[PDB]
Symmetry: C6
Subunit: 95 residues, 6 copies
């Protein structure tokens, strides 16, 4: 796979997170690299790919959870992070 764009969707609840997480990977060719628990209820999900692929993922992921549980927080794409920032980005999630 090996694109490096970043898709991110932030939710309130893990349940919306997991639909997001899944609709995203069903959408385009992304890699789910992280699911984090931020405290306070937000959960983020994070996937990497090429730019087209990651643009689609997030769109699809957005309108999939927007009404699941307590809903969507943000949904956002950095087509190319800076190497400085990959030091806080996970490689693969913790199962």
């Amino acid at each position: 796979v090996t694109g490096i764009a970043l898709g991110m969707i932030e939710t309130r609840g893990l349940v919306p997170a997991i639909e997001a997480a899944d609709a995203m990977t069903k959408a385009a060719e992304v890699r789910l690299v992280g699911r984090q628990f931020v405290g306070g209820g937000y959960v983020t999900v994070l996937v990497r790919g090429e730019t087209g692929a990651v643009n689609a993922a997030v769109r699809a992921g957005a309108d999939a959870c927007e009404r699941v549980g307590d809903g969507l927080v943000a949904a956002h794409i950095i087509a190319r992070v800076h190497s400085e920032v990959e030091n806080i980005l996970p490689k693969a999630p913790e199962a």
Copy 2:
């Protein structure tokens, strides 16, 4: 057992979670694979099975906690996740 659909119910409180967790397994043939603490008070419960089995579980689990403690958050079914997503799904809960 070995179905792979996913049942998920998100709650506010562990106490509603545990009724959910139990009414679900009493309902159909599902496996309780996870109970997670999301921070901020939501707790999720997660079970796997075949599709029929997991459709029933969640329905039953929903109307069982909807009035327990602080109540139900979401209740949702992914009849078939993508392997990318099983990397954040637990296999069995932590006792």
Copy 3:
């Protein structure tokens, strides 16, 4: 002791939790098997016994904390959980 019913009281604060925890064990013959911190402020307390014993525990535990600190969240009894669910139930609390 060795009943298997379940008593559960959910609170907002540990202080209400501990009165609950104590009035419960003073009430009937239950075993305090868990005190968990759910994040977000709820704390749950959990005890096992026979059915009569655990019915009484919770009643007594309820009206004991209902006005302690930030108060009672839920109070609820599963006279018989399913073995699937004992995989998230603790055996004895962590001191």
Copy 4:
């Protein structure tokens, strides 16, 4: 020292907790056996002693933090817990 009554004060903030914690021990002869972080912002402080000693502690501790930071949550005394309950009570706090 070795009384076994229990004094408990629950706060919103550690800062009110620490004034409580200190005014309490200055008040009567109690032992500070625990300071716990409950998540969600409440912090509890817990001390043991004889009954007179622990009655005074809490009174003094109450009106000492009631206006510190975000304030007092509860303040409560179990003159004698049940041994079942000492399994969730700490022996000495974690420094």
Copy 5:
């Protein structure tokens, strides 16, 4: 250094905490002995010194963060804690 008074400022956010933490040490001769995360968003910062030194620290620290981020929670001085209470006070923060 080795005074034993205690300065404490509680905040909502780490960012106000860190300005506090710094304006305090710039103010008088205190030792930053702790920065704790209380859950729920409050963060506390804690410094030791002589009494004059620690009185000044906190004043300076107060009006420095009162408008940073989500702001100041409390700000408070125990000129002399009881040894019972030093069992919950850290010696030096965790970097």
Copy 6:
């Protein structure tokens, strides 16, 4: 690199945090030294540099997340912390 000014942006959500984190490093020459989870939903991001560099970073980082997810909390610069304070500042984030 090796400046020692400090840039800090506090957010509500990790997703705004990560845009901040990235726009900052794209802005000037800073080092991302930390991303912390404060509990309760705030997340902070922290970078070091020279003064000019770190002034720019934060400005850029501010108006980049102000509308991402749940948004910006604070945004703040200590051109020179005190060595006492570097004992709570991380050296490099945890990946």
